[PDB]
């Protein structure tokens, strides 16, 4: 039902406003993602109950829904495949993913995500919780970790960030050995910029590698 990553990227190439700043590209990115989602049957909103593994995912600036189409869905499918029989529940982070918060620092969004993390840990104390972010969503994850103590962050199994605008900064109050940051060569966002270039839109290619990073970190008996 879903296309291959190659077919997915070729369809995006027809509409994505490559070379524009996020401000100039915002509405075209949102429309392009929505059109690809409708064409391919890819969900841009996730609100599952906790699974054996649960991912809290913060989407990119101007991405539709609560997970977008570019990266999140591919990462969830790869992770579910890598988990075999174990179930994966995905919950999108309900924040605006606005241009202004990207340009400012997305900080109250970090506090809200820190509350969502605390709430999921209380509601699902037996799930293996993984945090994921793309673009501004990676800033939200960084800010959530900055607002949590090391004892709470110790309850997180893994963190995966794609196209991190804070690339180079570690995830606060957390073991860096449990973090994977995927930042493509030539992605202007990872350089602290605001230009949307092709390397920022192709993180679906890293879904399998990101899933492989997570799997060893989500065992109930590996301490």
Curated annotation (Swiss-Prot):
Q: Which family does it belong to?
A: Belongs to the cutinase family.
**Keywords noted in UniProt:** Disulfide bond, Hydrolase, Secreted, Serine esterase, Signal
What is recorded about the protein's domains?
A: In contract to classical cutinases, possesses a lid formed by two N-terminal helices which covers its active site. The lid opens in the presence of surfactants to uncover the catalytic crevice, allowing enzyme activity and inhibition.
Where in the sequence is the active site? 135 (nucleophile), 187, 200 (proton donor/acceptor)
Give an example GO molecular function: cutinase activity
User: Looking at the record, which segments are called Lid covering the active site of the uncomplexed enzyme?
Assistant: 16-41
Describe regulators of its activity. Weakly inhibited by n-undecyl phosphonate (C11Y4). Activity unaffected by paraoxon.
Please give the biological process terms from Gene Ontology that the record holds.
carbohydrate catabolic process
Any keyword Secreted? yes
Tell me what this protein is called.
Cutinase
Places the protein is found: Secreted
Reaction equation(s) it catalyzes: cutin + H2O = cutin monomers
- Give the EC class as a word: hydrolase
Disulphides: 26-62, 50-124, 183-190
**Per its database record, what is this protein's job?**
Catalyzes the hydrolysis of complex carboxylic polyesters found in the cell wall of plants. Degrades cutin, a macromolecule that forms the structure of the plant cuticle.
Q: What is its main location?
A: secreted
Q: Which residues of the parent chain are present?
A: 45 to 248 of 248
Tell me which residues are marked as the site Transition state stabilizer.
61, 136
Top-level division of the source organism's lineage: Eukaryota
A GO cellular component term found in this entry reads: extracellular region
**Enzyme Commission number:** 3.1.1.74
